[PDB]
Enzyme design. Structure first.
Site, PDB file in Angstrom:
ATOM      1  N   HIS A   9      -0.646 -17.048 -10.258  1.00 35.49           N
ATOM      2  CA  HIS A   9       0.467 -16.178 -10.571  1.00 35.49           C
ATOM      3  C   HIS A   9       1.421 -16.012  -9.381  1.00 35.49           C
ATOM      4  CE1 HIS A   9      -1.890 -15.163 -14.097  1.00 35.49           C
ATOM      5  NE2 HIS A   9      -2.853 -14.691 -13.320  1.00 35.49           N
ATOM      6  N   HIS A  20       2.024 -10.270  -1.271  1.00 32.87           N
ATOM      7  CA  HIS A  20       2.463 -11.405  -2.046  1.00 32.87           C
ATOM      8  C   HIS A  20       3.944 -11.307  -2.344  1.00 32.87           C
ATOM      9  CE1 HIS A  20       1.626  -8.274  -5.012  1.00 32.87           C
ATOM     10  NE2 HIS A  20       2.665  -8.800  -5.645  1.00 32.87           N
ATOM     11  N   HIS A  63       7.259 -12.398  -5.288  1.00 36.78           N
ATOM     12  CA  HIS A  63       7.788 -12.867  -6.546  1.00 36.78           C
ATOM     13  C   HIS A  63       9.100 -13.571  -6.262  1.00 36.78           C
ATOM     14  CE1 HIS A  63       4.952 -10.152  -8.695  1.00 36.78           C
ATOM     15  NE2 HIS A  63       5.090  -9.416  -7.613  1.00 36.78           N
ATOM     16  N   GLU A  65      11.889  -8.450  -8.664  1.00 39.89           N
ATOM     17  CA  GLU A  65      11.434  -7.616  -9.773  1.00 39.89           C
ATOM     18  C   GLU A  65      12.289  -6.385  -9.856  1.00 39.89           C
ATOM     19  OE1 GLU A  65       7.004  -7.527  -9.424  1.00 39.89           O
ATOM     20  OE2 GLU A  65       7.317  -9.017 -11.032  1.00 39.89           O
ATOM     21  N   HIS A  82       5.813  -7.776  -1.792  1.00 35.49           N
ATOM     22  CA  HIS A  82       4.984  -6.618  -2.098  1.00 35.49           C
ATOM     23  C   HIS A  82       3.825  -6.528  -1.133  1.00 35.49           C
ATOM     24  CE1 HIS A  82       6.580  -6.665  -6.484  1.00 35.49           C
ATOM     25  NE2 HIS A  82       7.432  -6.078  -5.622  1.00 35.49           N
ATOM     26  N   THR A  93       3.125  -4.550 -11.547  1.00 42.73           N
ATOM     27  CA  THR A  93       4.118  -5.322 -12.281  1.00 42.73           C
ATOM     28  C   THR A  93       3.517  -6.545 -12.965  1.00 42.73           C
ATOM     29  OG1 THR A  93       4.783  -6.735 -10.473  1.00 42.73           O
ATOM     30  CG2 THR A  93       5.942  -4.627 -10.675  1.00 42.73           C
TER      31      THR A  93
HETATM   32  N1  LIG Z   1      -5.810  -6.793  -9.636  1.00 44.20           N
HETATM   33  C1  LIG Z   1      -4.519  -6.045  -9.644  1.00 44.20           C
HETATM   34  C2  LIG Z   1      -3.718  -6.713  -8.570  1.00 44.20           C
HETATM   35  C3  LIG Z   1      -2.243  -6.367  -8.460  1.00 44.20           C
HETATM   36  C4  LIG Z   1      -1.783  -5.865  -7.246  1.00 44.20           C
HETATM   37  C5  LIG Z   1      -0.444  -5.646  -7.034  1.00 44.20           C
HETATM   38  C6  LIG Z   1       0.480  -5.926  -8.034  1.00 44.20           C
HETATM   39  S1  LIG Z   1       2.225  -5.612  -7.775  1.00 44.20           S
HETATM   40  N2  LIG Z   1       3.018  -6.925  -8.233  1.00 44.20           N
HETATM   41  O1  LIG Z   1       2.517  -4.509  -8.660  1.00 44.20           O
HETATM   42  O2  LIG Z   1       2.358  -5.421  -6.363  1.00 44.20           O
HETATM   43  C7  LIG Z   1       0.058  -6.458  -9.246  1.00 44.20           C
HETATM   44  C8  LIG Z   1      -1.309  -6.665  -9.440  1.00 44.20           C
HETATM   45 ZN   LIG Z   2       3.961  -7.911  -6.860  1.00 51.31          ZN
END
Ligand SMILES: NCCc1ccc(S(N)(=O)=O)cc1
Ligand SMILES: [Zn+2]
EC number: 4.2.1.1
Length: 258
Positions: A62, A92, A94, A104, A117, A196
């Site tokens: 992902h 990570h 996006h 996002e 993020h 998200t």
């Molecule tokens: N296992 C849940 C992991 C998860 C951690 C962070 C995010 S975000 N994109 O909202 O920072 C989504 C999923």
């Molecule tokens: Zn994220």
């Protein structure tokens, strides 16, 4: 279990396995800068990453996550809208297929090329899994990326992506300093939201920095060479792994700056 960002498994489909997708505090959102209100009640944000201990980078199909040792308070976020101490677990990104999309969150409907993020969990709940059962379990620091000059502190990440091209691959990624990914200013917007991606859990205090970081075209092009697919499978480039803005509903976005 088979969600993604495609036409047949993307954000418009998530609600069937994850009905909270239609919930009251989903993320991301559009940040209407003229409606966000300055809040003098916010205390300064404290990003304390001096002892951060990165461990590994993982392509999870992902995005890719840079994972940290969160067995102790080595890298924490405090202050701002937060009560208590939030420990860094991973970061990570996006990003888009083209520079005109990928973030996002949006700012006055503007989409940035990408969004970083930095994910943190509230230490009062003892582990991430328990934290995501709590409405104040997580804090995600979001940072926009625009394409322009290169970001020197990002290059070590870009340079390891060739070794994690496909889903399930990981690589050692020790001694990476996430301070090198921050903009100068810590001026932010904040609101209560969700993860998200599935499971879309409504546990997150979002802190979105106003100031984007600049990355070079060559750096983001290397993001776009990752694959959603596993090794040996037909190639599906990892691009456009962003959820669009969701309804604000009964929420107010607060600004830390005038
Ligand atoms: N296992 C849940 C992991 C998860 C951690 C962070 C995010 S975000 N994109 O909202 O920072 C989504 C999923
Ligand atoms: Zn994220």
């Amino acid at each position: 279990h088979h969600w993604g960002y495609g036409k047949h498994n993307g954000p418009e489909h998530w609600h069937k396995d994850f009905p909270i997708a239609k919930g009251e505090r989903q993320s991301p959102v559009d940040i209407d800068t003229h409606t966000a209100k300055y809040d003098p009640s916010l205390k300064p944000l404290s990003v304390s990453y001096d002892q951060a201990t990165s461990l590994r980078i993982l392509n999870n199909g992902h995005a890719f996550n840079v994972e940290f040792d969160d067995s102790q308070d080595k890298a924490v976020l405090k202050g701002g809208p937060l009560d208590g101490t939030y420990r860094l677990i991973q970061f990570h990104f996006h990003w888009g297929s083209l520079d005109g999309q990928g973030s996002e969150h949006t700012v006055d409907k503007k989409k940035y090329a990408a969004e970083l993020h930095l994910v943190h969990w509230n230490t009062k709940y003892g582990d991430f899994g328990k934290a995501v059962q709590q409405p104040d379990g997580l804090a995600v620091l979001g940072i926009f990326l625009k394409v322009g000059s290169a970001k020197p502190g990002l290059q070590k990440v870009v340079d390891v992506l060739d070794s994690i091209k496909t889903k399930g691959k990981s690589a050692d990624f020790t001694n990476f300093d996430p301070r090198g990914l921050l903009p100068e200013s810590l001026d932010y917007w904040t609101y209560p939201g969700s993860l998200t991606t599935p499971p879309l859990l409504e546990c997150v205090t979002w802190i979105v920095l106003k100031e984007p970081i600049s990355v070079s075209s060559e750096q983001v092009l290397k993001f776009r060479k990752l694959n959603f697919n596993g090794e040996g499978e037909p190639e599906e480039l990892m691009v456009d792994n962003w959820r669009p803005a969701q309804p604000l509903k009964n929420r107010q976005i607060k600004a830390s700056f005038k």
